[PDB]
Amino acid sequence: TKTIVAAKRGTIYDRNGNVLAEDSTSYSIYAIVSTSYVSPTREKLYVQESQFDKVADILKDKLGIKKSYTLAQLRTKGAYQVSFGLKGKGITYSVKEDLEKTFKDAGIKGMAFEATTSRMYPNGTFASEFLGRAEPIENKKDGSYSLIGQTGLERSLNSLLTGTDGEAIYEKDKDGNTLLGTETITKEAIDGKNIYTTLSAPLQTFLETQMDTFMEQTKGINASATVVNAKTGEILATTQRPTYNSDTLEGQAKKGYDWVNRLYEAQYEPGSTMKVMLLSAAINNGSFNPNATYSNANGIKVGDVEINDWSINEGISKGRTMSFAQGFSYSSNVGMTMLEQAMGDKVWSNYLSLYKFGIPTRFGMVGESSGIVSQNSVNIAQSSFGQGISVTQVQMLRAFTAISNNGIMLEPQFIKQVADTNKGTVRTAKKEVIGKPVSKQAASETRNYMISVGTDPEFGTLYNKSEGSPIIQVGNNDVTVKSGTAQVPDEKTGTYKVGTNETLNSVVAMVPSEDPEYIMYVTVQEPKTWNNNFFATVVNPVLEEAMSMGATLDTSVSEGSGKTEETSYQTGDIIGKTPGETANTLRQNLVHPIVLGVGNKIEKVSVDAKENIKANEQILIMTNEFTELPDMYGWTKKNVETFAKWKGIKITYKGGKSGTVTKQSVAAGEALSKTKKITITLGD
Ligand SMILES: [Cl-]
Numbered sequence: 001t002k003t004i005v006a007a008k009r010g011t012i013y014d015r016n017g018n019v020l021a022e023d024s025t026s027y028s029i030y031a032i033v034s035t036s037y038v039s040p041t042r043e044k045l046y047v048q049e050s051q052f053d054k055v056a057d058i059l060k061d062k063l064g065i066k067k068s069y070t071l072a073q074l075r076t077k078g079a080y081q082v083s084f085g086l087k088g089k090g091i092t093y094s095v096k097e098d099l100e101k102t103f104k105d106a107g108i109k110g111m112a113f114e115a116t117t118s119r120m121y122p123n124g125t126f127a128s129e130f131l132g133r134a135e136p137i138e139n140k141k142d143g144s145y146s147l148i149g150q151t152g153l154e155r156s157l158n159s160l161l162t163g164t165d166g167e168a169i170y171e172k173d174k175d176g177n178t179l180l181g182t183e184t185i186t187k188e189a190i191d192g193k194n195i196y197t198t199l200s201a202p203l204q205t206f207l208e209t210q211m212d213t214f215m216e217q218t219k220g221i222n223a224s225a226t227v228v229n230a231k232t233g234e235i236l237a238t239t240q241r242p243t244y245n246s247d248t249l250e251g252q253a254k255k256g257y258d259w260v261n262r263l264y265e266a267q268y269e270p271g272s273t274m275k276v277m278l279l280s281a282a283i284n285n286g287s288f289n290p291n292a293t294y295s296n297a298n299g300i301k302v303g304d305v306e307i308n309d310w311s312i313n314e315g316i317s318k319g320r321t322m323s324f325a326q327g328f329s330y331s332s333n334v335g336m337t338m339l340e341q342a343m344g345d346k347v348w349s350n351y352l353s354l355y356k357f358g359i360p361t362r363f364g365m366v367g368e369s370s371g372i373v374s375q376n377s378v379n380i381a382q383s384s385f386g387q388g389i390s391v392t393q394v395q396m397l398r399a400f401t402a403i404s405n406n407g408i409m410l411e412p413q414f415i416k417q418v419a420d421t422n423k424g425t426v427r428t429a430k431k432e433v434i435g436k437p438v439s440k441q442a443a444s445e446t447r448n449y450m451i452s453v454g455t456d457p458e459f460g461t462l463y464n465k466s467e468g469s470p471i472i473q474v475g476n477n478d479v480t481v482k483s484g485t486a487q488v489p490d491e492k493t494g495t496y497k498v499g500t501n502e503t504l505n506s507v508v509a510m511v512p513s514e515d516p517e518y519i520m521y522v523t524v525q526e527p528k529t530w531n532n533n534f535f536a537t538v539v540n541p542v543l544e545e546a547m548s549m550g551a552t553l554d555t556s557v558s559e560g561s562g563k564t565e566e567t568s569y570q571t572g573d574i575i576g577k578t579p580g581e582t583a584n585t586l587r588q589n590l591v592h593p594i595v596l597g598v599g600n601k602i603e604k605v606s607v608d609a610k611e612n613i614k615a616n617e618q619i620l621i622m623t624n625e626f627t628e629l630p631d632m633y634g635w636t637k638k639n640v641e642t643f644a645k646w647k648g649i650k651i652t653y654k655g656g657k658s659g660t661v662t663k664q665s666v667a668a669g670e671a672l673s674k675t676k677k678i679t680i681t682l683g684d
Helices: 049-064 067-074 092-106 152-156 200-219 271-285 324-329 335-345 345-354 378-384 392-404 440-454 531-547 581-587 637-647
Strands: 003-005 019-032 111-120 134-138 144-151 167-169 185-188 193-195 222-229 237-240 293-295 300-302 305-307 320-322 416-418 425-428 433-435 482-485 503-511 518-525 594-595 602-605 618-623 650-654 660-664 677-684
Touching: 019 092, 049 067, 049 092, 092 111, 111 134, 144 152, 144 271, 185 300, 200 222, 200 237, 200 518, 200 531, 222 392, 222 531, 222 618, 271 335, 271 345, 271 378, 271 440, 271 482, 271 503, 293 324, 300 335, 300 378, 305 335, 305 378, 305 660, 320 324, 324 335, 324 440, 335 378, 345 378, 392 503, 392 518, 416 581, 425 677, 440 482, 440 650, 503 531, 518 531, 581 594, 581 618, 637 650, 637 660, 637 677
Parallel strands: 594 618, 650 677
Antiparallel strands: 003 167, 019 111, 134 144, 167 185, 193 416, 222 237, 222 518, 293 320, 300 305, 416 425, 482 503, 503 518, 602 618, 660 677
């Protein structure tokens, strides 16, 4: 009868190899005292009574165990193998080796050591919710232990992190009970793969400190902050509050601790940061005249609902005439609602679809929420200022990348490299283009209008009138910013809470404004004390730290792995599986899947079950319900051809075969049943 030998679990690193989570082995000492423990020729293999006293001398000197306790245990009646309590467990490797040498030199047999593995998180309170926990779980079949990811990244990448288990034959007493430390390995375990995350430990450490200060200032019930590379979608730092120490779990049992992951599980109405998307759509639609004016004095009525600006609802002013650019700076709900009505519900609702709201990112984590998008006319209008629509933080980050990256939306990423150290192979990530909601010009103009949110002394909601300067500053750079306030729903009444500061406050910042390098998004729910100036506590120093790092944030193990052989990967049989979870799995393995349609079953895939898929290779997964033309921006020609063949559409190409789609002559969302021809422009 065999016993499983758990493989070493893979190490989780930051982007440059700083250890975030790793296995740690310690040992438990046992002594076999049964007079039945002899070889076939009756060689005594147990610890003999003539030696009990010497064992106590050794245990006292080496472990600080009182001689009388060692002696007591060694003399236990009816016992086969005995242990030695707390001092007999958690023994380091160096001490174990010393103890072994001591018994061997003293001619004492029967002492043994059983390995016990724990997961170590060296950075303590550091992206704790993101990393999650792997815990020791007992296999009820054979009594073996192995580490199993329970939450966060540990749980999400458990398949990669977990090696292939080994096998051993343990000796047993006559009662069938396993004798520990006696193993003979028969099948060697194969180590798990290492995961290099996109995180920058230095930046993350700095973010944790500033986030603690931000919580002291606001006393909010929860908060989040994430920094993203504006050009690649890589998550460089991410945290939430309240949090806990990953190594000791301290904070998890604190009053008010919230177990919900704020990056991808929590669903919320985002509020005014959504005006960034709105404004970009208005500019892209051609329905934005920055200079045209309007009045917020009477608000605006949609259906049977009244919409008003913040200053009107707080009695700051009787109303005022503003430019649309000024209303954007001022975060005027009325001005934005007017822009929404000018483009119309159908158009705006389609922009939200192009921005992928209501669709999970499937970026690699398990338990991601999808958000909620309403098709009710009142909600569509409200969504223009981020109410009546539910999102996750990661959906907002994804949308922000199109603003920061010339209209080209990117998939947020948290895995930089997956490494097989046994084989010396790796799979290294590159950016994943997933759509193009607006033009380069619309994105650029949106970013420029966002500077005024910070710089306009009269209208900017993020200008510090007391200091005569913007709240958010990063060296001498122009900073693209947008603040937000959002009404929060009440569980009792269903409707929004009315208390002072009983809101979700947030900000998005991009620096430098004209050619962004970094995006930062911060949220705080129900701050006891609030002032927009508090954002300077967390945004300013973190973005300045990011800018000061340079090649430390650009580089990773990627620079040094270009000559390293690439690990092979294949999907296996996925026809009939669920598209969502399959796409999520593929991204964990650095594949860039494109899910076609909304069905819950995979009908076709552009690569075969045993076909090798290179890192970053783009593939198509056609679901069983696919009726509308996708946004094909960034698709490879191979994928355009596969799609066209699957749906019987005639494609005319403009551009070299090596390129990816830069333009399509038929708009995304048109019925496939009426689409016979498309002109696709390729850009290499
Ligand atoms: Cl997807």
